[PDB]
Design a protein around this ligand. Structure first.
Ligand SMILES: [Mg+2]
Ligand SMILES: [Mg+2]
Ligand SMILES: [Mg+2]
Ligand SMILES: [Mg+2]
Lengths: 129, 258, 170, 165, 153
RNA sequence: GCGCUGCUGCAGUUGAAACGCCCGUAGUUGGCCCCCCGCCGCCACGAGGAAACGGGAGCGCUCCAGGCAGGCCCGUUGGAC
């Protein structure tokens, strides 16, 4: 059965971007998907998107610009102590200069840079570069 | 499982704030029972030998104590292992030196020289009010001193001023918000501050919040909060008014002294 | 008039008990001095009860009941002190005792995951409380009452039967 | 408790030849024209909605200066459960904020039924919701899109816009 | 067809986006409610009731007219059955299979199907026992299924 | 060393290895939705609680392994954390 909607959405996004398309459709929308896409947009990776209301698990349409290189999720959301982020950065990201790691905290969904700025920790959701 | 009480003390198992050297020897002095317990006291010989440097060995300290050259609250003590504690009086008449035992910001015992106007008394913290034989009310203090027939207005955790000459109360300080206090245990030993909040948790410890004069705020449990007067201290305090510096500031001080 | 009805009801319970010859001994409340029941006026209290404190209130059943239990926290001679815990009822087959189920989590650092664990805790249940399997109870600590019992029930929150057994840490 | 109320009451007394209205709200629009909202208590909304278009046109013609709209007054609660200390109190879903806003949007243009909704998330601009209306009405309502957007922004801070499809 | 099979069909119905009644609708909530009374009195399952209403009276969705579902209306009128319809039909099918089997004790595919149907019945009965839709004492026994079927109908 | 015990991080068509198939309890995992209430997990801070070992500030036992010292006008010299 369907479990992780975000994983399906990200896989579809990468599949479409691989063959140089311009628009993708994701079926089951959700708040977490919307925040993930908002962060991606803010960092300049996927331009804009729209949500279509059908009264049943709204759909969503996104527009690409051939900048995204890889996106993914960590299924069992482990807890990241505020001082245990550099290990994950080294393990997951190509470099310490570019790339982002998404965490959910009591203060909301934020990039790992922001969490390092505020010296707090939380749970890991995904990553992209 | 030992068959009886313990009489020795290994050097490594001794309290840290005594500052004994690791290689000084295998053993350390074992304080005898008295006004203060093992973990909130310090033996007399350590003061007489490793601090004032008046003696170089155990035998010299024993001879000095036998000659009755040291007074502790006006009563000569001949025990090299007599425990000394907070808010004690340490006067040596033969050299006209009088000190009061207090805590430094770092959390160690210190000797603060005093004057004669305030050297005839001591401050005591009341921990218990109980009925003794025949229903006569009593009270006990942190230095193991019991007083009969006290004023009803005195309650627990208050502070009491007893004259050493006779041993009678003259006045007391209530435990309330806005009274200067001194911390006698934990991570905040030696700090001075003023009470700002009192939060009581049913069936568990009561927490006391006080603010330092500079503006710092810290928390500690009521078991080691000692009132030392109203607004201003009743007794003398070390040069620094209970202000703990940070590591950087302490390093700057060390470099300046070097 | 309300107090008068209570005293009569309490008085009957004492005299119908003396007609239960099957019992080996006569069970009584230690605090009350037998002899007050010979007074026709209601000038004396016939039943003893206390408040355990900690914000819990005494059930009306204990105050108006007609039962004797020296291990009850309200009408007996025990005191509550220490830790207060919660759990669900696992079995209620003994005379005045039950088995309580507690659930918690254990973390394993190597695998960065958890385990679900449970323990069984036996407690004393006073007649003032009615309990079936699955209900939530609050237990307070007391002195050793038996080989395995060191807790006493203080509060019962009913749960519907047929409900799904679920992992419920408390 | 004002001046427009007497005028609307007079109109209502003229129209018949047993209802009652809670209050009146006036919203400004970019142009000199303004908008007025008549608050009909919830149980009588369906009573007012039988002849809403006729009432609105008669009210507009009798008194000009701003357009008239009819919307019900619904309360909003802010706790899914309310802990009284003993039992539990649950908020009905009809009192949620999301349902109320949708009901308001439906009521603002009652005669025409919304065929779709879409919310855009531009790269930098604030997200805005655009609705979809039947192609038939088109110009029959094209002169009230600005006022509709203004009122929807006023009652609910969510900005919007209109298209036809 | 997935729980007890390998099929992956996707035949369903798609209801409209708008929840409003049809413009040509000429029925109030009372008139339809009386219609359910007559149909229910005659002994008809809610699904067939909806079929009849949609076909004969041209009512695509009862909810859009009355604001409530059929079984809710019946319960408000105190006419809903004690045993939900789907479980009742499951039990009917099981009884029919059991009769055919006791007629002949060499068909094994029938036994297979009986196993599947009984498993489904047990699952649904457990779900209904939870949520307090059925008496806690409710239990399904194959030996006396026909009798209760007759009474509970 | 060994990603040849694999949580990070193995393999299962042919090299070793998918139960003959179905039902099914315990167990594990379970779509979307209400901004603010209660509880559980989670994050941060804090209190309380031995040192020695480990890290670490300062000091020229001739250096070093080490130790807590030394000169003088010494933070109340220091042994901080
Ligand atoms: Mg299956
Ligand atoms: Mg399918
Ligand atoms: Mg082969
Ligand atoms: Mg092989």
């Amino acid at each position: 059965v369907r479990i992780n909607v975000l994983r399906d959405a990200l896989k579809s996004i990468c599949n479409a971007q691989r063959i140089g398309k311009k628009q993708v459709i994701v079926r089951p929308s959700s708040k977490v998907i919307i925040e993930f896409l908002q962060l991606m947009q803010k960092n300049g990776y996927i331009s804009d998107f729209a949500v279509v209301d059908n009264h049943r698990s709204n759909r969503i349409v996104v527009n690409l610009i051939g900048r995204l290189n890889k996106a993914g999720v960590i299924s069992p959301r482990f807890d990241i102590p505020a001082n245990d982020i550099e290990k994950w950065v080294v393990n997951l990201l190509p470099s310490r200069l570019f790339g982002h790691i998404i965490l959910t905290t009591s203060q909301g969904i934020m990039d790992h840079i922001e969490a390092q700025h505020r010296q707090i920790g939380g749970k890991v959701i995904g990553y992209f570069y | 499982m030992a068959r009886g009480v313990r009489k020795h003390l290994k050097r490594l198992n001794a309290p840290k704030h005594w500052l004994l050297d690791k290689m000084g020897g295998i053993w350390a002095p074992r304080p005898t029972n008295g006004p203060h317990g093992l973990r909130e006291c310090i033996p007399l010989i350590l003061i007489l030998r490793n601090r004032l440097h008046y003696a170089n060995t155990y035998a010299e300290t024993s001879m000095i104590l036998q000659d009755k050259n040291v007074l502790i609250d006006g009563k000569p003590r001949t025990d090299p292992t007599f425990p000394v504690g907070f808010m004690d009086v340490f006067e040596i008449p033969k050299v006209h030196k009088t000190f009061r035992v207090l805590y430094d910001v770092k959390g160690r015992f210190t000797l603060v020289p005093i004057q004669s106007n305030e050297a005839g008394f001591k401050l005591c913290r009341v921990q218990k009010i109980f009925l003794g034989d025949k229903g006569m009310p009593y009270l006990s203090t942190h230095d193991a001193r019991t007083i009969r027939f006290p004023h009803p207005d005195i309650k627990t955790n208050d502070t009491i001023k007893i004259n050493l000459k006779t041993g009678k109360i003259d006045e007391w300080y209530k435990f309330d918000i806005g009274k200067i206090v001194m911390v006698t245990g934990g991570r905040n030993c030696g700090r001075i501050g003023t009470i700002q909040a009192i939060d009581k948790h049913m069936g568990s410890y009561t927490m006391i919040r006080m603010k330092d004069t500079e503006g710092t705020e810290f928390l500690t449990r009521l078991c080691n909060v000692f009132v030392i007067g109203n607004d201003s201290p009743a007794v003398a305090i070390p040069t620094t008014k209970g202000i703990r510096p940070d590591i950087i500031k302490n390093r700057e001080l060390r470099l300046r002294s070097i | 008039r309300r107090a008068l009805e209570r005293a009569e009801t309490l008085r009957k319970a004492a005299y119908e008990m003396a007609e239960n010859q099957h019992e080996r001994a006569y069970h009584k409340q230690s605090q009350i001095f037998q002899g007050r029941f010979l007074r026709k006026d209601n000038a004396r209290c016939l039943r003893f009860y206390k408040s355990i404190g900690m914000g819990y209130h005494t059930p009306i059943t204990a105050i108006n009941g007609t039962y004797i239990d020296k291990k009850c926290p309200f009408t007996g001679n025990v005191s509550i002190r220490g830790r207060i815990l919660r759990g669900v009822v696992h079995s209620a087959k003994m005379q005045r005792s039950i088995i309580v189920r507690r659930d918690y989590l254990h973390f394993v650092q190597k695998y960065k995951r958890y385990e679900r664990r449970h323990k069984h805790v036996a407690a004393h249940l006073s007649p003032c409380f009615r309990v079936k399997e699955g209900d939530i109870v609050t237990i307070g600590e007391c002195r050793p009452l038996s080989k395995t019992i060191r807790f006493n029930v203080i509060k019962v929150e009913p749960v519907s039967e047929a409900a799904k057994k679920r992992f419920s840490p408390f | 408790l004002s001046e427009l109320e007497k005028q609307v009451a007079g109109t209502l007394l003229k129209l018949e030849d047993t209802l009652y209205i809670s209050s009146v709200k006036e919203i400004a629009v970019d142009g000199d024209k303004k908008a007025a909202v008549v608050y009909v208590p919830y149980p009588m909304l369906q009573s007012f909605q039988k002849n809403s278009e006729a009432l609105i046109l008669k009210l507009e013609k009798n008194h000009s200066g701003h357009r008239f709209i009819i919307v019900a007054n619904r309360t909003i609660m802010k706790n899914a459960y309310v802990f009284t200390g003993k039992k539990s109190i649950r908020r009905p879903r009809s009192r949620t904020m999301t349902s109320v806003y949708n009901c308001i949007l439906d009521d603002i243009c009652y005669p025409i039924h919304v065929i779709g909704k879409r919310t855009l998330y531009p790269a930098g601009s604030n997200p805005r919701l655009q609705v979809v209306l039947p192609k038939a009405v088109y110009n029959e309502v094209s002169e009230r899109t600005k006022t509709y957007s203004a009122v929807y922004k006023a009652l609910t801070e969510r900005d919007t816009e209109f298209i036809f499809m | 067809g997935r729980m007890h099979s390998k099929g992956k069909g996707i035949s369903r119905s798609a209801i409209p986006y708008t929840r409003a009644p049809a413009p040509w609708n000429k029925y109030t909530p009372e008139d339809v409610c009386e219609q359910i009374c007559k149909l229910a009195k005659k002994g008809t399952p809610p699904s067939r009731i909806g079929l009849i209403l949609r076909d004969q009276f041209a009512i695509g969705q009862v909810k859009n007219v009355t604001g409530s579902k059929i079984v809710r209306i019946l319960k408000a009128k105190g006419l809903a059955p004690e045993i939900p319809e789907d479980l009742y039909c499951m039990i009917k099918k099981a009884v029919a299979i059991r009769k055919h089997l006791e007629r002949s004790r060499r068909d094994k595919d029938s036994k297979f199907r009986l196993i599947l149907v009984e498993s489904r019945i047990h699952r649904l009965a457990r779900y209904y026992r939870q949520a307090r839709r059925l008496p806690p004492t409710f239990r399904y026994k194959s030996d006396q299924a026909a009798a209760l079927l007759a009474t509970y109908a």
